[PDB]
Design a protein around this ligand. Structure first.
Ligand code: CL
Ligand code: CL
Ligand code: CL
Ligand code: CL
Ligand code: CL
Ligand code: CL
Ligand code: ZN
Ligand code: ZN
Ligand code: ZN
Ligand code: ZN
Ligand code: ZN
Ligand code: ZN
Ligand code: ZN
Ligand code: ZN
Lengths: 351, 351, 351, 351
């Protein structure tokens, strides 16, 4: 068949070992009538991929180990390789450049039929991004321009997450924006905050190289979230508290700092995957009654793929995609991932 | 001058005494050019009035005792008694039935000029509701129909709070609504949830007489918030978790129960005044990341007075105003208040 | 097979004959794996059904005559009679009470994947409402309560149209509402305007019996749209121009009158199917620049079915469904339809 | 007193003469307690100023000629020169850089107290922009940064109009935008469409130099609105019809072309001042029923001043302000205005 990567182990806390990723052989998949097979050209690696591997997994930890070796990868671009007859009839053709949405909506539960497909009750997940060929239902497949640079469109899915979070934070003309975390999603939020009219953008992180990267992506200020007094410096710099707070570190200290930074009537969005003891103490009197704060979550996003595809030419990923490796050299890619030095890493899957 | 009530003491925790209200003599107030004097006909008593008196007041407790005896009352209807020359020019005339907004916006700070007058930086408060005559700036004075029953329009201000909270919870066609607290604001939210298309309305309280009152105001279900298992019964009755949660008890257990009841993508609104240790622990992973919950505060409301005045004929206050006393018998009114038995109490101020 | 009604002719303007409806024999349909067959119990007849038959059809007129005899009917309730294997797996079972959505979304065009399924590019329409058994894709089938009165749930689809139009007009607390047309959709908008907090509701029609029906459904005022001066009486009665205008007659005079009634910053919604020369002259200077009016269209609605199903117990259809006939007596039902006397007519399909 | 410009004549159609602007002497104005006197440093000239002078004025034409010589100018920046005692108490001080809002809201009519101050019933207008010193109520005066370049902040008011129109057109991530008119407001909409995430921006005008200017301000395409076939080229270039249409020419042909360009479910905003016979024929069937178009007006904007002030550093006015003259040379400025060659002209008022 073909080359595919699988998660072979996850973080073992009672031996102190990290998770592993290994290439195995897999048979060539075949599409049914409504399905489409992609030849994958670029796949990107995500923070959730890293959490599976190096992360603290909750009651969920037993279940996942249950099913290793596990296919993964949900951020990918490539070219249609083969089309079922129904899909051909809906216009999909071999040779079309596309991206795929890992999530399969059932279209016949209540959430689905209220438009809330990201809350689908019979949600399917097709996680074969890190495969040379992958099959999806035609509803998951989205065309992109014929002249598209596939490397950048591999980031379509994480851009949807960033777009949903920005929209949920209500970034708009003249607002001040605080972004917790200078990772890949962070850098996309910086760019999107600019493209939503934000007049002040401040990024917070521990790592100083990443603060420099935030400024390169368009942030006005970039601050160390570990230095004490940081809240007041930040409020000073923005002339007041922040209208929009976006929490992407998944850490409870950043989350609490986010809430503190939030202006009266402001919108805070917690979109990271959180770990153990993930409590945000909200003060009913001061945060809510006196300050009228709005605290939101964010799961998956819905209906964002076409939008995201339209935004790609407005984004500059030369400031976000910081490493590219070949599938052959996947081992180095995952070393780079585990280093946590890089905003986004892509793998070129046909090499 | 005239009869007016003042708060003469507040809750003394280091002697275990309750707050007191006493009538004193006060001079007749006189309006400047832009001001208007009202002859007050009905005044209503509020939950915040009760918190001053019988309540736990925080670092705020020293400040308030600083300034006793203190005028109070912010829910009132009556008739214009005298008009400054500028106000007459804006159309206000002696004999007009009106209600007053206690809050005075400065109109020249940033919040004011962003439309967020409820967050005014130089906020003024005119708290002389429990006075036979009171003066306000013309911007605070709102006319009501010539044939209006003044008793019901005394509830205009608390209806604005209820309207803002309902709107913030996004009550709309086909949503399920959970209301924590079967007090006056609670009963108004029941009526307003009906008038916003809610298809399931469940009220929660400790007191059983109040649960009966909720059903009389239009609630579908009324449940005891102290009985264990109540969450699951409630979710059973509504066929699922609640789209809209409205927290008006000011208690942290009701607040936590509210969050638990809240559906995925639901809106919870915390509009009560909270007491000591008012912490809502929010789980970032389950409440926010997985469930996409929206948690909101609510302070004062903005631009709601004309709306509220238009809604009065749609409301039925015969199910909410449960006691009327004369100003002469104010002492019984405040006994009734301290009993906490009644949804709303009104005082007729010209008797 | 079974009994089914078909449109056998449409309005012939060059002979002055009306359209006809006739029962024919049809084979029993069979569901594929993802399909479901309904035994139809109640079917309702619509204004669009009447326009096909007695109406002026545009360039569209040649196309439709092309394909007579034509199945029709898109408003129906009944019971699941047979389930394909995939659908059974998604939980649909014989014996379940359901309603059907005539519209089939493809789920793989751009509108579909932006959430705008009512603008689907490969839209399918299953118009076999007036059939004893009909087949639909499982995505079109919605369950209703086990104890549901099927007669009322036959109106689920037109309630979705009414719900979308009300939402598009932004009916909400304290708004004034003008509804053009006292037909079935009109009566549903009256009820929905009440359930959205409207403080003034005025219905306009030519026919006086229908104005009485508007008052019975909850309208505050009901006026004759042909009497001259009607606009000013209406504005008088509402204390001003209308915040929400809903145009359901499909006539250009009602449409123009609607725009005139509309308040500054108001929302007018044109949701009827219009005939020949359907021009609304909008004055850029007075309607738009000075008055800041918002003029909207409305096609089909999207994601409204679950909502509508939840609203049914809040509606009172004893004031809307004014005639019920048996399928056997369909000929009288269509006479009643062509009379235009009745708000809604239902046919009981198993008799 | 001081130098001030007045409109001395308007367009005389029954002699074919244009309007005139002349400097006269005016006394120094004095602020009351709540007022503030500005020393004006920069004033900008507007399209409405040009319509008074060279324009077709309707039934309004007799009224305006009634009151010549008339003060004008409503786009200005400068420095506080003197403060009434109440205003000083609200924090305004001599030496503060500011801009002024010409519009005075009464704060005590129904529109005002519903938040719709741009629809104020007792609206006041202070049109003395083209004066060396002007007085306004403190509510009209907005501070800007101490280091602000006053020339650019003179454009605060027209930016508010552009911001309101953009918001009303719902410009947001991934939308296509059509702007009719490559004037100053046009160029600001180009910049704002970029800063709201628009993925395609096309400007339409007659004049080719102005089309080049649109491309310099960030438009993707710039097309001649007089060339036939232009609609289809534009739809070709954008891959479909436009989500957002903004009509700023005030001409009925551009308005009609705008509606034609508008996508299904799109938002068109007509914010220009229109002339004689300003009719937009809307087709109820095709524009509204089938296409679900949304057509909006726009008057003044509300609560936009602080926002606009925050956006100024995000805008680049070196591509918009194309001429600066001294008050001394005002005659050339108005020649430049009447030439209609330039996007925006500013006058430096202390020279
Ligand atoms: Cl703040
Ligand atoms: Cl929200
Ligand atoms: Cl849920
Ligand atoms: Cl109006
Ligand atoms: Cl379109
Ligand atoms: Cl809208
Ligand atoms: Zn589903
Ligand atoms: Zn991802
Ligand atoms: Zn203020
Ligand atoms: Zn109150
Ligand atoms: Zn489709
Ligand atoms: Zn229908
Ligand atoms: Zn006003
Ligand atoms: Zn202007």
């Amino acid at each position: 068949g073909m080359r595919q990567l699988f998660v072979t182990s996850i973080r073992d806390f009672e031996k102190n070992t990290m998770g592993t990723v290994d290439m195995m052989e897999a048979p060539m998949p075949e599409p049914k009538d409504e399905e489409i097979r992609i030849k994958v050209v670029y796949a990107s690696i995500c923070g959730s991929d890293t959490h599976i591997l190096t992360g603290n997994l909750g009651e969920m930890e037993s279940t996942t180990r249950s099913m290793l070796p596990m296919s993964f990868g949900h951020e990918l671009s490539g070219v249609i390789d083969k089309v079922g007859s129904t899909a051909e009839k809906m216009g999909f053709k071999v040779g079309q450049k596309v991206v795929a949405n890992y999530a399969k909506y059932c279209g016949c539960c209540e959430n689905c039929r209220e438009g809330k497909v990201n809350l689908c009750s019979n949600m399917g997940y097709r996680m074969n991004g890190f495969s040379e060929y992958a099959v999806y239902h035609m509803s998951q497949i989205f065309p992109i321009p014929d002249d598209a640079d596939l490397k950048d469109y591999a980031l379509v899915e994480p851009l949807t997450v960033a777009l949903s979070s920005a929209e949920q934070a209500k970034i708009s003309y003249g607002k001040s924006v605080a972004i917790m975390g200078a990772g890949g999603l962070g850098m996309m939020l910086v760019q999107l905050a600019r493209l939503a009219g934000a007049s002040t953008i401040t990024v917070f992180d521990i790592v100083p190289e990443k603060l420099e990267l935030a400024l390169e992506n368009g942030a006005d200020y970039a601050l160390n979230s570990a230095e004490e007094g940081v809240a007041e410096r930040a409020i000073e710099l923005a002339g007041g508290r922040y209208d929009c707070v976006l929490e992407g570190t998944g850490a409870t200290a950043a989350a609490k700092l986010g809430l503190q930074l939030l202006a009266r009537d402001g919108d805070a969005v917690y979109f990271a995957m959180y770990g153990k003891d993930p409590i945000l103490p909200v003060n009913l009197q001061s945060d809510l009654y006196w300050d009228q704060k709005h605290i939101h979550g964010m799961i998956q996003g819905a209906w964002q793929f076409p939008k995201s595809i339209r935004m790609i030419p407005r984004m500059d990923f030369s400031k976000i995609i910081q490493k590219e490796h070949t599938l052959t050299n996947y081992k180095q890619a995952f070393e780079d991932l585990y280093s946590k030095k890089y905003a986004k890493i892509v793998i070129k899957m046909d090499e």
